Paper text:
Each protein contains six canonical RNA-binding domains, two RNA recognition motif (RRM) domains and four hnRNP K homology (KH) domains.
Similar to ZBP1KH34, we found that the individual KH3 and KH4 domains of IMP2 adopted the type 1 KH fold (βααββα) and were also arranged in an anti-parallel pseudo-dimer orientation. We observed that IMP2KH34 had lower affinity to the ß-actin C28 zipcode RNA (Kd = 161 nM) compared with ZBP1KH34 (Kd = 15 nM). We hypothesized that the highly conserved GXXG motifs mediate phosphate backbone interactions and that the variable loops functioned to recognize specific nucleobases. We found that this exchange converted IMP2 into a ZBP1 like binding protein, which bound to the ß-actin zipcode, the ZBP1 RNA-binding element.
Author numbering: 425 to 586
Write the structure that this text describes.
């Protein structure tokens, strides 16, 4: 139950609703979830998505991400007859990324089949100063939470070993 950083991407048009008047909503979410929730600066004036940085343990991530998913649903940011679907980025050790993929890509293939979330480890990544790379997770709230949960397990199982 360590403190993780998750980048959750939301539609740019929803920033005002997520922040709220005088920032009352995003402050409320931060207290409710017990997590830090900040809106990262925009890469440009016409980007279609904005990045929310959520810092906190798994139980806090569930509440912070969940309340953001739920707020977007209230604001009607889903497709017709569909659930709110968001992309999130998590950081895993570069040395464990191959284990998330599995031999022949079979581990990531089963993972996507069980959760219904799309799980992508972008190619040709340069590990960051912590020697960590990105895993992309796209799906509805519960699918995203389950995918995140199992990826965290794989990461911890590899550490356990040696």
């Amino acid at each position: 139950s360590e403190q993780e950083i998750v980048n959750l991407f939301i539609p740019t048009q929803a920033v005002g609703a997520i922040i709220g008047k005088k920032g009352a909503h995003i402050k409320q979410l931060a207290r409710f979830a017990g997590a830090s929730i900040k809106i990262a600066p925009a890469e440009g004036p016409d980007v279609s998505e904005r990045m929310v940085i959520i810092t906190g343990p798994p139980e806090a991530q569930f509440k912070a991400q969940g309340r953001i998913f739920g707020k977007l649903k209230e604001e009607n940011f889903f497709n017709p007859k569909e659930e709110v679907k968001l992309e999130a980025h998590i950081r895993v050790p570069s040395s464990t990324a191959g284990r998330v993929i599995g031999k022949g890509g079979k581990t990531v293939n089963e993972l996507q089949n069980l959760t219904s979330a799309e799980v992508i480890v972008p190619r040709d990544q340069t590990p960051d100063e912590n020697e960590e790379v990105i895993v992309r997770i796209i799906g509805h709230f519960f699918a995203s939470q389950t995918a995140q949960r199992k990826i965290r397990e794989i990461v911890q199982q590899v550490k356990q070993q040696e």
